[PDB]
Design an enzyme around this catalytic site. Structure first.
Site, short mmCIF file in Angstrom:
data_model
loop_
_atom_site.label_atom_id
_atom_site.label_comp_id
_atom_site.label_asym_id
_atom_site.label_seq_id
_atom_site.Cartn_x
_atom_site.Cartn_y
_atom_site.Cartn_z
N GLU A 57 11.41 13.41 -0.31
CA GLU A 57 10.38 12.77 -1.10
C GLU A 57 9.00 13.35 -0.79
N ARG A 77 1.09 1.74 15.12
CA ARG A 77 0.93 1.53 13.69
C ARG A 77 1.36 0.11 13.31
N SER A 130 13.64 5.98 -13.65
CA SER A 130 12.63 6.78 -14.34
C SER A 130 12.52 8.17 -13.72
N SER A 131 12.55 8.25 -12.40
CA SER A 131 12.42 9.54 -11.73
C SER A 131 13.57 10.47 -12.09
N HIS A 140 0.83 -1.19 0.00
CA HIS A 140 0.00 0.00 0.00
C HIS A 140 0.87 1.25 0.00
N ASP A 174 7.51 21.13 -27.87
CA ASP A 174 7.43 19.82 -27.21
C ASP A 174 8.52 19.76 -26.13
N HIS A 177 14.05 14.18 11.92
CA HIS A 177 12.85 14.21 12.74
C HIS A 177 12.08 12.90 12.64
N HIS A 178 12.46 12.02 11.71
CA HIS A 178 11.96 10.66 11.62
C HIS A 178 12.73 9.69 12.51
N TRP A 217 7.05 0.12 4.31
CA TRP A 217 7.54 0.80 3.12
C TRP A 217 8.87 1.48 3.36
N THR A 250 6.16 27.74 4.34
CA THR A 250 4.90 27.07 4.03
C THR A 250 3.71 27.92 4.43
N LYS A 284 2.92 30.78 1.79
CA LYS A 284 2.18 30.33 0.62
C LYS A 284 0.69 30.20 0.92
N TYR A 319 8.25 16.25 0.10
CA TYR A 319 8.12 17.54 -0.57
C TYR A 319 8.22 17.44 -2.08
N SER A 344 -1.83 27.05 -7.19
CA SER A 344 -1.62 28.44 -7.57
C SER A 344 -2.30 28.76 -8.89
N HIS A 404 12.42 12.39 3.52
CA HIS A 404 11.65 13.61 3.72
C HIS A 404 11.67 14.47 2.46
C1 HEA Z 1 3.45 15.32 1.46
C2 HEA Z 1 3.40 14.70 2.62
C3 HEA Z 1 3.92 15.40 3.82
C4 HEA Z 1 4.07 16.80 4.16
C5 HEA Z 1 3.81 18.13 3.51
C6 HEA Z 1 4.65 16.77 5.52
C7 HEA Z 1 4.95 17.92 6.20
C8 HEA Z 1 5.49 17.96 7.46
N1 HEA Z 1 5.79 16.86 8.21
FE1 HEA Z 1 5.56 14.96 7.72
N2 HEA Z 1 5.32 13.06 7.23
C9 HEA Z 1 4.82 12.56 6.07
C10 HEA Z 1 4.38 13.29 5.01
C11 HEA Z 1 4.38 14.65 5.00
N3 HEA Z 1 4.82 15.49 5.98
C12 HEA Z 1 4.80 11.08 6.08
C13 HEA Z 1 4.29 10.34 4.87
C14 HEA Z 1 5.36 10.68 7.35
C15 HEA Z 1 5.54 9.30 7.93
C16 HEA Z 1 6.56 8.48 7.16
C17 HEA Z 1 6.76 7.26 8.02
O1 HEA Z 1 7.10 7.48 9.21
O2 HEA Z 1 6.67 6.12 7.54
C18 HEA Z 1 5.63 11.98 7.99
C19 HEA Z 1 6.15 12.01 9.24
C20 HEA Z 1 6.46 13.14 9.91
C21 HEA Z 1 7.01 13.03 11.27
C22 HEA Z 1 7.37 11.78 12.03
C23 HEA Z 1 6.55 11.62 13.30
C24 HEA Z 1 6.96 10.27 13.84
O3 HEA Z 1 7.69 9.56 13.12
O4 HEA Z 1 6.57 9.93 14.97
C25 HEA Z 1 7.18 14.42 11.61
C26 HEA Z 1 7.76 15.00 12.84
O5 HEA Z 1 8.69 15.78 12.74
C27 HEA Z 1 6.74 15.22 10.46
C28 HEA Z 1 6.73 16.58 10.44
C29 HEA Z 1 6.30 17.33 9.39
C30 HEA Z 1 6.34 18.80 9.43
C31 HEA Z 1 6.87 19.47 10.67
C32 HEA Z 1 5.80 19.24 8.17
C33 HEA Z 1 5.58 20.59 7.57
O6 HEA Z 1 5.80 20.58 6.16
C34 HEA Z 1 4.17 21.14 7.81
C35 HEA Z 1 4.18 22.61 7.42
C36 HEA Z 1 2.79 23.18 7.32
C37 HEA Z 1 2.23 23.88 8.32
C38 HEA Z 1 3.01 24.16 9.57
C39 HEA Z 1 0.83 24.43 8.16
C40 HEA Z 1 0.80 25.58 7.16
C41 HEA Z 1 1.57 26.74 7.75
C42 HEA Z 1 0.94 27.65 8.51
C43 HEA Z 1 -0.54 27.56 8.73
C44 HEA Z 1 1.71 28.81 9.10
C45 HEA Z 1 1.39 28.98 10.58
C46 HEA Z 1 1.84 27.72 11.29
C47 HEA Z 1 2.82 27.78 12.21
C48 HEA Z 1 3.48 29.09 12.52
C49 HEA Z 1 3.27 26.53 12.91
N4 HEA Z 1 6.29 14.41 9.46
C1 HEA Z 2 -0.23 8.95 -1.15
C2 HEA Z 2 -0.21 7.73 -0.66
C3 HEA Z 2 -1.41 7.18 0.01
C4 HEA Z 2 -2.82 7.25 -0.27
C5 HEA Z 2 -3.72 7.87 -1.30
C6 HEA Z 2 -3.42 6.47 0.84
C7 HEA Z 2 -4.77 6.29 0.94
C8 HEA Z 2 -5.37 5.59 1.94
N1 HEA Z 2 -4.73 4.96 2.97
FE1 HEA Z 2 -2.80 4.89 3.30
N2 HEA Z 2 -0.86 4.81 3.64
C9 HEA Z 2 0.12 5.38 2.91
C10 HEA Z 2 -0.05 6.11 1.78
C11 HEA Z 2 -1.27 6.38 1.23
N3 HEA Z 2 -2.48 5.98 1.70
C12 HEA Z 2 1.45 5.10 3.48
C13 HEA Z 2 2.66 5.66 2.78
C14 HEA Z 2 1.23 4.31 4.66
C15 HEA Z 2 2.21 3.73 5.64
C16 HEA Z 2 2.71 2.40 5.09
C17 HEA Z 2 3.32 1.61 6.22
O1 HEA Z 2 2.80 1.68 7.35
O2 HEA Z 2 4.33 0.91 5.98
C18 HEA Z 2 -0.24 4.18 4.67
C19 HEA Z 2 -0.83 3.48 5.66
C20 HEA Z 2 -2.17 3.31 5.75
C21 HEA Z 2 -2.71 2.50 6.86
C22 HEA Z 2 -1.98 1.87 8.00
C23 HEA Z 2 -1.91 0.36 7.96
C24 HEA Z 2 -0.85 0.06 8.98
O3 HEA Z 2 0.36 0.19 8.68
O4 HEA Z 2 -1.24 -0.37 10.08
C25 HEA Z 2 -4.12 2.61 6.60
C26 HEA Z 2 -5.29 2.05 7.31
O5 HEA Z 2 -5.56 2.54 8.39
C27 HEA Z 2 -4.30 3.39 5.38
C28 HEA Z 2 -5.53 3.64 4.85
C29 HEA Z 2 -5.71 4.38 3.72
C30 HEA Z 2 -7.06 4.62 3.19
C31 HEA Z 2 -8.23 4.05 3.93
C32 HEA Z 2 -6.83 5.43 2.02
C33 HEA Z 2 -7.68 6.02 0.97
O6 HEA Z 2 -8.36 4.94 0.32
C34 HEA Z 2 -8.72 6.96 1.54
C35 HEA Z 2 -9.80 7.21 0.49
C36 HEA Z 2 -9.31 8.00 -0.70
C37 HEA Z 2 -9.40 7.50 -1.94
C38 HEA Z 2 -9.95 6.11 -2.13
C39 HEA Z 2 -8.91 8.28 -3.14
C40 HEA Z 2 -7.55 7.78 -3.58
C41 HEA Z 2 -7.44 7.88 -5.08
C42 HEA Z 2 -6.24 7.84 -5.68
C43 HEA Z 2 -5.01 7.65 -4.85
C44 HEA Z 2 -6.07 7.93 -7.18
C45 HEA Z 2 -5.71 9.34 -7.62
C46 HEA Z 2 -5.40 9.32 -9.09
C47 HEA Z 2 -5.71 10.36 -9.87
C48 HEA Z 2 -6.41 11.54 -9.26
C49 HEA Z 2 -5.39 10.34 -11.33
N4 HEA Z 2 -3.11 3.80 4.90
O1 LIG Z 3 8.06 13.59 6.56
O2 LIG Z 3 7.63 14.91 6.97
CU LIG Z 4 9.99 13.99 7.33
#
Ligand code: HEA
Ligand code: HEA
Ligand SMILES: [O-][O-]
Ligand SMILES: [Cu+2]
Ligand SMILES: CCCCCCCCCCCCCCCCCC(=O)OC[C@H](COP(=O)([O-])OCC(O)COP(=O)([O-])OC[C@@H](COC(=O)CCCCCCCCCCCCCCCCC)OC(=O)CCCCCCCCCCCCCCCCC)OC(=O)CCCCCCCCCCCCCCCCC
Ligand SMILES: CCCCCCCCCCCCCCCCCC(=O)OC[C@H](COP(=O)([O-])OCC(O)COP(=O)([O-])OC[C@@H](COC(=O)CCCCCCCCCCCCCCCCC)OC(=O)CCCCCCCCCCCCCCCCC)OC(=O)CCCCCCCCCCCCCCCCC
Ligand SMILES: CCCCCCCCCCCCCCCCCC(=O)OC[C@H](COP(=O)([O-])OCC(O)COP(=O)([O-])OC[C@@H](COC(=O)CCCCCCCCCCCCCCCCC)OC(=O)CCCCCCCCCCCCCCCCC)OC(=O)CCCCCCCCCCCCCCCCC
Ligand SMILES: CCCCCCCC/C=C/CCCCCCCC(=O)OC[C@H](COP(=O)(O)OCCN)OC(=O)CCCCCCC/C=C/CCCCCCCC
Ligand SMILES: CCCCCCCC/C=C\CCCCCCCC(=O)OC[C@H](COP(=O)(O)OCCN)OC(=O)CCCCCCC/C=C\CCCCCCCC
Ligand SMILES: CCCCCCCC/C=C\CCCCCCCC(=O)OC[C@H](COP(=O)(O)OCCN)OC(=O)CCCCCCC/C=C\CCCCCCCC
Ligand SMILES: CCCCCCCC/C=C\CCCCCCCC(=O)OC[C@H](COP(=O)(O)OCCN)OC(=O)CCCCCCC/C=C\CCCCCCCC
Ligand code: CUA
Ligand SMILES: [K+]
Ligand SMILES: [Mg+2]
Lengths: 100, 186, 90, 131, 100, 47, 65, 49, 459, 60, 61
Positions: I230, I428, I152-153, I60, I90, I277-278, I125, I303, I306, I232, I243, I228
């Site tokens: 990734e 988890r 590919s990426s 998943h 193109d 932070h992970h 994953w 962030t 924006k 972003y 935008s 991380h």
């Molecule tokens: C695209 C996906 C995405 C994005 C944008 C982010 C954004 C951020 N993530 Fe991430 N993060 C994940 C995807 C993402 N993350 C995933 C997938 C994991 C788990 C991976 C795994 O463990 O397997 C993860 C895990 C993860 C952890 C791990 C927690 C743990 O392992 O127990 C933490 C903690 O530091 C973290 C922090 C953040 C922070 C601080 C931001 C910042 O970018 C957020 C910034 C945005 C805001 C802050 C809000 C908008 C800003 C404002 C409204 C301004 C005013 C706000 C303030 C002044 C605070 N992320």
């Molecule tokens: C972007 C990536 C992505 C997306 C879309 C989702 C979508 C969803 N995920 Fe996600 N999920 C992950 C990334 C994602 N997840 C990752 C990275 C983990 C951690 C893996 C790990 O633990 O090792 C995770 C883990 C995770 C768990 C934890 C299982 C566990 O480890 O114990 C669960 C269930 O609770 C869950 C549920 C769901 C559900 C219910 C939806 C969605 O079904 C919710 C409903 C939304 C939709 C059905 C729309 C989705 C449609 C598309 C994605 C297609 C878009 C295409 C076009 C627009 C062209 N996810």
């Molecule tokens: O990963 O934030």
């Molecule tokens: Cu991170």
């Protein structure tokens, strides 16, 4: 007797009087692996000088146990008995300064 | 920002100036093919990026972040007892690494750690001074702060003398209560 | 300039801001030096900052302290409210 | 010299040097659960500790990365092979605090709970003396 | 012909960086009071004493370190059964006579 | 100690160590700031 | 040519054969089966049943069904 | 100017949680001191099964 | 032809098509997870087949990240409009563009084939060793897929960077969004490849990096040094889309264009230096923890800028224009949803809060709100905006208020309860759990089945 | 222009202030976890597949 | 969970406090378990309670 007697003599003494507290040389880090290896090396050097039966070396083993998990000690203690423990090779049979 | 190419742009001397930027902006540019066009495009970029007030905020943020980053890297290499670049101590068993053990205690007591540890009473309600006393002496004895941490700590009174229950929750009163029962030493 | 609207910097300091490229470089350098200095002058300094007998007591501290001292609140606040675990059952 | 190996005077005079005891804590199976046991959290051997005492927990992992988590004690330390992480704790109230492994560790990651029971120091001493 | 980097950029940033690293390290050592005198030897005191005895002639030359400890591992017991320091010294003496 | 049914436990529950209390209060300290950040921004999502 | 002006002209001009759409949906359906079929196969391999009965790994009342 | 209404609305709603947190800390300080829920010399080791 | 086509716009369509196909497998796995977690007991996976659940969660995550959202937001919309936005005929590298999509498909086939043929086990994953290196051959197959995907990426990143050499107009914010993601890929991917090769060496070449005296924490550093960046690389293209949509639909010029651009650049630099932070719970040094916590909180500044610049884009727009278009609703919903995800990110950024919330479903809900809700909706909104240009039909989405409302409500029913169980606490990557966490797990499960049903109404 | 520039400043520096308001709390709580405490007892915990081994000093 | 029980009492005394756990079922099998019982556990639990009463009287002495 002196208040700073523990620091005097050696840094080793501090944990010898307080076995379950941080060692001054490793308190900065949460990971205590290096602490375990120093304590084991000290047990190994004690036996070479005093023998296994000496109460001092027996306590140096208790000190090693305080920081070393049993599964690591049992393995390292077998290597020591065979004669393959790298922390106990006599210094004149070390290869650390050879070929580089 | 002038709108006529006849009016020159002021430049300071140095390695980051209007003249320095002009010399290098068009090095890789296929669009600056003649003086008139080159100057027009150069001023267009300068007007858009350097005369934009909000852009300077990000310049501050990158400098601050990078400065912290460079310094934390340098500090680890220069002072952290566990980072080795020289090999003398790594060619000896652990008990013999005296020169590296010298970094340990100084590194264990940074200034900010001494300055901010007393403010644990802004996060703990019961026995915030539970870990203050230590007879060994590797670290200083800790005294609780007299004021709340500045900022978002509105839930606690500005000063702890204002709080009615503060003194009765101290590790000293708790020790008194439990010692009266014979329950525990601490 | 720290926490400064640069529109103000452009207006009040026109000659210092004439070269906007150089102005940007100073912005980066100044904040780089600030970050570097914080680590090695506020965090790093060893065996410093442990003078807890010198806790700063601001003018507001004394205003509020004297007010409570004048009344009995300061004495009452500092008094230990309970130093026993169990109440006595009648 | 003998003095390069610091030892307290009591042991040099013949006092017994302490030994260590190891025990294994395993999940109680579904078919072995009793009427009152909590499913997915009970274990066959709990870890008893004294309350109102500073305890140093040294946590490592033998084979893969586990994670020793006790939410009530505010502890979540990764049991990583090669790292013996030190965690200090001071329990303030008696009770039984349940936790679970917090790092995917294989097939039965969900079946190795962490049960810690904190008792009075007098009770802990009696327990340790008997077990 | 237009320049992008410093005219001597490669040497400047290479030697320059090395200089800053070296100078910063000296400053760091001064602030922490680190001993700056290089020791190339092990610090095991009992061992260094045995080595002096060999240099003084108190212990015969080429005597192994395991021939001097108060506890031997299994591999060193194997070696002790075939150890003949006296024969080794005579062999070295014969070589010197042949060479001269 | 143990999870209980249908409990929000926002920020944590039933601490039994001084550090556990610290964790709960750190979350509680920041929570109002988070609400402010959300409310203040969402209120302006409109034409 | 006018027919070649638009990419995927038949689809954009609404003349494409419906089989192309059917294949796309079938391909997605097959992709979904890669999560369900191995689940059934693995369950039977290690248990002898294609799918469990809710709470059949726990103690059940006498009248449970 | 309207965005200020949002600041004030977000400051009111945030202050509600400040008050809850404030009362929470008062309650916590009285648990180990007065609350009958706090019991000592109560939990006994279960022993190995 | 079909497979031979080099047209950049056709290839863009292929990327979206393949993302939906692979997405079906992704959603199915998600349904399996939520069904299992509906109560305590075994529901659809036997206790003797618990290894399958570990594989389900692993696949998943990997598929949704690398084979669905990344190919959709960085391969699909980019390959279709970027050369048009750049007023160029193109894409710069036609033949490379063709092979990139073919590579993605081939790596997908390898992964799914490994499900069918290999023993089904999982290691997350994040493929943490030593667990990843003591597994069966399915782990080897997954590694091949990731390495192939990496090829590919990187080549696609090279393709987009070359637009700077040929762009005949102005670099719009969206173009800046893709360029910076490309830079992030060029700098992060080579590190990932190295650590993946070391995983292979221990799996297949008798290497000993991840056995005692070798630090397993080493992997986590190199992995998350890519990990991380990734997250972003997956969000920045979404920001670029938001935008364009807001400016176009509201007929308002982007406000603070240069601040938007400089905010994207800033997020990238900061995102390249905050990876640990992970790794808060491993036991890193106090100063390291403080550095990473400090820099992680800084990312909110750019962030935040924006977000507020987007809000003023929607403010003041003409009332006469109909605001119920699905693309506009999704763009607005992104701001509302992203703030939730980001704020929770800042909460978990505090390491002491993180000790309690690491490896709990609070982290799940955090990154779902950003990806499963925010990124998905952004991709949908972008495709919807380009419906006339792309030309697809036979769906009822463009004006469907029911779909938007039902999706928003039900998606929140799934992940809002996962924040609650994070303080319960439910770890988890588990399938069985205590009976006192059923309520919230049940509510989220009801949300998952409902969302799937709403996906059928579009046709 | 003047009003807009001030808003943009606030769009950047209001978040900066909040971050600075969290910075001091973050340092303190980090320092608190890493505090040299006078611990009097040690419990060694080893994690194996799939059980937890505990080593404790036995009363003399 | 002694601090959850103390904090619930304090909150309820101050104002209107509503718990979902109080009104709703905690498991989904409640629809079928209206009359379900484990009679073997009932006999064992009753026996243990009787033994506990004897131990309590002995402890009182
Ligand atoms: C695209 C996906 C995405 C994005 C944008 C982010 C954004 C951020 N993530 Fe991430 N993060 C994940 C995807 C993402 N993350 C995933 C997938 C994991 C788990 C991976 C795994 O463990 O397997 C993860 C895990 C993860 C952890 C791990 C927690 C743990 O392992 O127990 C933490 C903690 O530091 C973290 C922090 C953040 C922070 C601080 C931001 C910042 O970018 C957020 C910034 C945005 C805001 C802050 C809000 C908008 C800003 C404002 C409204 C301004 C005013 C706000 C303030 C002044 C605070 N992320
Ligand atoms: C972007 C990536 C992505 C997306 C879309 C989702 C979508 C969803 N995920 Fe996600 N999920 C992950 C990334 C994602 N997840 C990752 C990275 C983990 C951690 C893996 C790990 O633990 O090792 C995770 C883990 C995770 C768990 C934890 C299982 C566990 O480890 O114990 C669960 C269930 O609770 C869950 C549920 C769901 C559900 C219910 C939806 C969605 O079904 C919710 C409903 C939304 C939709 C059905 C729309 C989705 C449609 C598309 C994605 C297609 C878009 C295409 C076009 C627009 C062209 N996810
Ligand atoms: O990963 O934030
Ligand atoms: Cu991170
Ligand atoms: C130079 C040059 O000639 O560029 C144009 C030139 C093309 O010629 P052209 O015809 O003039 O181009 C037309 C314009 O593109 C059309 O542009 P325009 O006319 O519309 O706009 C004017 C201006 C518009 O652009 C600008 O003016 C922008 C200038 C600023 C860019 C951002 C700089 C970084 C942020 C600040 C950092 C501060 C650090 C402080 C540290 C302090 C320490 C003390 O144009 C350009 O500058 C175009 C070039 C932009 C190049 C961007 C390259 C990538 C930037 C990556 C940023 C950082 C990412 C970090 C990732 C994470 C790292 C850990 O570019 C190239 O030749 C492209 C080569 C690409 C190679 C890629 C592979 C490299 C390896
Ligand atoms: C997330 C989901 C929900 C999303 C909702 C939101 C969506 C928003 C909108 C998104 C829009 C994106 C952009 C769209 C752009 C569209 C552009 C377009 O149409 O391009 C034109 C393009 C082609 O049109 P054309 O230009 O006329 O092409 C002419 C041909 O080139 C030449 O014509 P031809 O007739 O000569 O063609 C050759 C034909 C010749 O075909 C035939 O002769 C076919 C004969 C009939 C066969 C039928 C299948 C039989 C299966 C039997 C199975 C038996 C199982 C037995 C089991 C027994 C168990 C006991 O094919 C072949 O020879 C090769 C076929 C290969 C592909 C099919 C592969 C199927 C799966 C295979 C699995 C194999 C697994 C092996 C495992 C082995 C393990 C050991 O259109 C398509 O390809 C169709 C696209 C249709 C959908 C478009 C999007 C509509 C909007 C979205 C709707 C929702 C979709 C949801 C996903 C699907 C859910 C399931
Ligand atoms: C003793 C031995 C000694 C040693 C010997 C050593 C010998 C060494 C030999 C070395 C070389 C060997 C290889 C030679 C390759 C030659 C290539 C070449 O030059 O071809 C020219 C040749 C040109 O053909 P042509 O003779 O001019 O005429 C062709 C026809 O007129 C047709 O005209 P067309 O090309 O316009 O039509 C193509 C198109 C026509 O379109 C359609 O059929 C309908 C429209 C599309 C329907 C919707 C499909 C789903 C949406 C896909 C979206 C993404 C598409 C991306 C682009 C396509 C990528 C394939 O349909 C297809 O054929 C494929 C469509 C896409 C299929 C995949 C879609 C996803 C399904 C997922 C299912 C499971 C989940 O290329 C082709 O047309 C065919 C190439 C076939 C390559 C197949 C490679 C498959 C690899 C699969 C994975 C392998 C591992 C696992 C396999 C497990 C099996 C159990
Ligand atoms: C070209 C002519 C020939 C040159 C030949 C040079 C050969 C040797 C080169 C070796 C690699 C370069 C570094 C040389 C260092 C020499 C001095 C030295 O030994 O330094 C040791 C010292 C620590 O030694 P220990 O005592 O073992 O540890 C005590 C506890 N921490 O290490 C160092 O200072 C060197 C390692 C760090 C080098 C880089 C400087 C550190 C900061 C890096 C910042 C990176 C981020 C970006 C910075 C951008 C610019 C501000
Ligand atoms: C205007 C700004 C300044 C206002 C005044 C500030 C001031 O004077 O604060 C003093 C006050 C101490 O006063 P008292 O506790 O009452 O007395 C000391 C008793 N021992 O200081 C503080 O509260 C602490 C201030 C800390 C500033 C920290 C700056 C940043 C430091 C580095 C942070 C981490 C960077 C990244 C990691 C680096 C790792 C090496
Ligand atoms: C019943 C489950 C859903 C079936 C479904 O919607 O399939 C749609 C899909 C595409 O059909 P149309 O959209 O009508 O395209 C033809 C040109 N208009 O139909 C099929 O693929 C038919 C075969 C489905 C097999 C499923 C197993
Ligand atoms: C983007 C390109 C620049 C990336 C620079 C990243 C540097 C971040 C600095 C983080 C830091 O302080 O490093 C500590 C941290 C380790 O900390 P601990 O495991 O606690 O060990 C400390 C003492 N035992 O350092 C690292 O992991 C550094 C990893 C190397 C990064 C190299 C990047 C190379 C880019 C080309
Ligand atoms: Cu062990 Cu999970
Ligand atoms: K279940
Ligand atoms: Mg983890």
């Amino acid at each position: 007797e002196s208040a700073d007697a523990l620091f005097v003599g050696t840094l080793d003494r501090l944990t010898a009087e307080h076995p379950h507290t941080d060692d001054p040389r490793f308190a900065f880090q949460s990971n205590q692996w290096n602490n375990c290896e120093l304590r084991f090396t000290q047990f190994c050097r004690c036996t070479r000088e005093l023998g296994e039966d000496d109460p001092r070396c027996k306590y140096q083993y208790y000190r090693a146990q305080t920081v070393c998990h049993e599964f690591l000690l049992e393995d390292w203690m077998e290597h020591r008995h065979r004669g393959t423990c790298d922390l106990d090779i006599m210094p004149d049979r070390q290869v650390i300064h050879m070929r580089g | 920002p002038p709108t006529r190419l006849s009016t020159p742009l002021y430049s300071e001397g140095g390695a980051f100036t209007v003249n320095w930027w002009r010399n290098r902006y068009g090095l890789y540019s296929r669009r600056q093919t003649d003086p008139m066009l080159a100057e027009f495009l150069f001023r267009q970029q300068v007007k858009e990026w350097f005369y934009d007030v909000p852009s300077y905020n990000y310049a501050a943020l990158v400098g601050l972040a990078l400065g912290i980053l460079v310094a934390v890297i340098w500090r680890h290499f220069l002072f952290n007892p566990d980072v080795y670049v020289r090999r003398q101590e790594l060619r000896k068993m652990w008990p013999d690494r005296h020169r590296q053990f010298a970094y340990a205690v100084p590194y264990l007591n940074p200034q900010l750690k001494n300055l901010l540890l007393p403010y644990k009473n802004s996060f703990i309600d019961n026995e915030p001074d539970y870990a203050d006393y230590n007879p060994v002496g590797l670290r200083p004895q800790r005294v609780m702060a007299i004021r709340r941490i500045p900022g978002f700590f509105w839930a606690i009174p500005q000063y702890f003398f204002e709080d009615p229950l503060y003194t009765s929750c101290s590790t000293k009163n708790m020790q008194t209560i439990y010692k009266k029962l014979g329950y525990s030493e601490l | 300039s720290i926490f400064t609207p640069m529109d103000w910097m452009f207006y009040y300091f026109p000659n210092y801001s004439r070269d906007k490229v150089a102005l940007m470089a100073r912005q980066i350098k100044i904040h780089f030096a600030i970050g570097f200095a914080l680590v090695f002058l506020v965090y790093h300094p060893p065996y410093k900052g442990a003078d807890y007998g010198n806790f700063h007591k601001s003018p507001l501290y004394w205003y509020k302290y004297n007010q409570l001292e004048r009344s009995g609140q300061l004495q009452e606040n500092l008094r230990i409210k309970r130093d026993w675990f169990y109440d006595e059952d009648p | 010299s003998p003095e390069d190996y610091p030892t307290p005077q009591k042991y040099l005079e013949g006092a017994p040097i302490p030994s260590w005891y190891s025990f294994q804590s395993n999940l109680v199976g579904d078919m072995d659960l009793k009427p009152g046991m909590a499913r997915m959290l009970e274990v066959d051997k709990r870890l008893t500790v004294p309350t109102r005492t500073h305890i140093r927990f040294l946590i490592t992992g033998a084979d893969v990365i586990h994670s020793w988590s006790v939410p009530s004690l505010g502890i979540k330390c990764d049991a990583t092979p090669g790292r013996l992480v030190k965690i200090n704790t001071f329990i303030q109230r008696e009770g039984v605090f349940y936790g679970q492994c917090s790092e995917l560790c294989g097939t039965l990651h969900a079946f190795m709970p962490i049960v810690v029971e904190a008792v009075s120091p007098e009770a802990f001493a009696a327990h340790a003396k008997k077990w | 012909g237009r320049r992008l980097l410093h005219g001597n950029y490669f040497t400047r940033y290479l030697f320059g960086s090395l200089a800053v690293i070296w100078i910063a390290e000296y400053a760091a050592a001064c602030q922490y009071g680190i001993p700056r005198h290089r020791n190339p030897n092990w610090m095991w005191s009992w061992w260094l004493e045995k080595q002096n005895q060999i240099k003084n002639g108190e212990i015969p030359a080429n005597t192994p370190g395991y021939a001097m400890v108060k506890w031997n591992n299994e591999a060193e017991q194997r070696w002790l059964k075939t150890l003949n320091v006296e024969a080794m010294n005579e062999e070295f003496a014969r070589r010197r006579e042949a060479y001269y | 100690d143990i999870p209980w049914p249908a409990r929000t436990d926002w920020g944590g529950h039933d601490p039994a160590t001084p550090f556990a209390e610290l964790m709960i209060n750190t979350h509680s300290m920041f929570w109002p700031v988070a609400i402010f950040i959300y409310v203040s921004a969402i209120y302006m999502v409109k034409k | 040519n006018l027919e070649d002006h638009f990419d995927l002209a038949e689809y954009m001009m609404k003349m494409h054969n419906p089989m192309s759409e059917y294949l796309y949906w079938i391909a997605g359906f097959v992709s979904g089966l890669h999560g369900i079929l191995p689940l059934l196969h693995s369950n039977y391999y290690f248990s002898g049943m294609f799918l469990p009965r809710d709470n059949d790994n726990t103690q059940l009342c006498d009248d449970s069904w | 100017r309207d965005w200020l209404i949002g600041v004030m609305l977000g400051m009111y709603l945030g202050n509600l949680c400040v008050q809850q947190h404030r009362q929470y800390r008062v309650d916590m300080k009285l648990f180990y001191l007065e609350a009958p829920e706090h019991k000592i010399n109560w939990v006994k080791p279960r022993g190995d099964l | 032809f079909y497979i031979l086509v080099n047209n950049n716009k056709r290839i863009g369509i292929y990327y979206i098509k393949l993302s939906i196909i692979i997405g079906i497998l992704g959603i199915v796995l998600s349904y399996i997870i939520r069904v299992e977690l509906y109560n305590s007991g075994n529901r659809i996976i036997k206790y003797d087949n618990v290894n399958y659940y570990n594989m389900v969660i692993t696949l998943h995550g990997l598929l949704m990240i690398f084979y669905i959202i990344m190919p959709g937001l960085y391969g699909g919309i980019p390959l279709y409009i970027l050369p048009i936005l750049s007023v160029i005929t193109d894409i710069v590298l036609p033949r490379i563009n063709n092979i990139s999509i073919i590579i993605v498909l081939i790596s997908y086939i390898v992964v799914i084939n490994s499900i069918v043929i290999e023993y089904n086990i999982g290691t997350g994953w994040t493929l943490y060793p030593p667990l990843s290196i003591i597994g069966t051959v399915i782990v080897n197959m997954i590694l091949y897929g990731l390495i192939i995907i990496g090829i590919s990426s990187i080549i696609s990143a090279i393709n987009f960077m070359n637009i700077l050499i040929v762009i005949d107009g102005i670099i719009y914010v969206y173009i800046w969004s893709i360029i910076i993601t490309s830079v992030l890929l060029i700098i992060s991917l080579p590190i990932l490849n190295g650590i993946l090769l070391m995983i292979l060496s221990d799996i297949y070449f008798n290497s000993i990096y991840f056995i005692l005296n070798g630090d397993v924490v080493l992997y986590q550093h190199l992995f998350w040094y890519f990990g991380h960046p990734e997250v972003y690389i997956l969000i920045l293209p979404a920001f670029g889309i938001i935008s364009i949509i807001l400016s176009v639909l509201n007929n308002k010029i982007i406000f603070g264009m240069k601040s938007m651009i400089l905010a994207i650049i800033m997020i990238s630099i900061l995102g390249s230096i905050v990876w640990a932070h992970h790794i808060y719970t491993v036991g890193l040094e106090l100063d390291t923890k403080i550095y990473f916590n400090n820099l992680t909180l800084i990312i909110s500044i750019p962030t935040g800028n924006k977000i507020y610049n987007w809000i003023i884009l929607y403010i003041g727009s003409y009332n006469i224009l109909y605001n119920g278009y699905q693309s506009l609703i999704f763009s607005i919903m992104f701001i509302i949803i992203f703030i939730i995800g980001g704020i929770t990110g800042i909460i978990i950024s505090i390491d002491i809060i993180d000790i309690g919330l690491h490896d709990t479903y609070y982290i799940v809900s955090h990154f779902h709100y950003i990806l499963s809700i925010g990124a998905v909706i952004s991709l949908l909104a972008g495709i919807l905006l380009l419906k006339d240009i792309i030309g697809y039909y036979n769906v009822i989405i463009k004006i469907n208020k029911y779909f938007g409302l039902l999706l928003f409500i039900n998606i929140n029913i799934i992940f809002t309860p996962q924040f609650i169980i994070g303080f319960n606490v439910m770890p988890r990557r588990i399938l069985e759990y205590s009976d006192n966490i059923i309520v919230w797990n049940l509510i989220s499960s009801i949300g998952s089945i409902s969302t799937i049903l709403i996906l059928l109404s579009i046709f | 222009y003047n009003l807009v520039m001030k808003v943009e400043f606030l769009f950047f520096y209001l978040p900066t202030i909040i971050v600075f308001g969290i910075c001091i709390p973050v340092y303190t709580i980090n320092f608190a976890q890493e505090e040299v405490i006078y611990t009097t007892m040690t419990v060694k915990v080893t994690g194996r597949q799939w059980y937890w081994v505990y080593e404790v000093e036995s009363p003399t | 969970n002694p601090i959850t029980r103390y904090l619930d009492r304090r909150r309820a005394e101050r104002g209107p406090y509503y718990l979902m756990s109080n009104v709703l079922p905690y498991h989904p099998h409640f629809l079928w378990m209206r009359n379900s019982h484990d009679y073997e556990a009932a006999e064992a639990l009753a026996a243990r309670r009787e033994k506990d009463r004897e131990l309590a009287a002995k402890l009182e002495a």
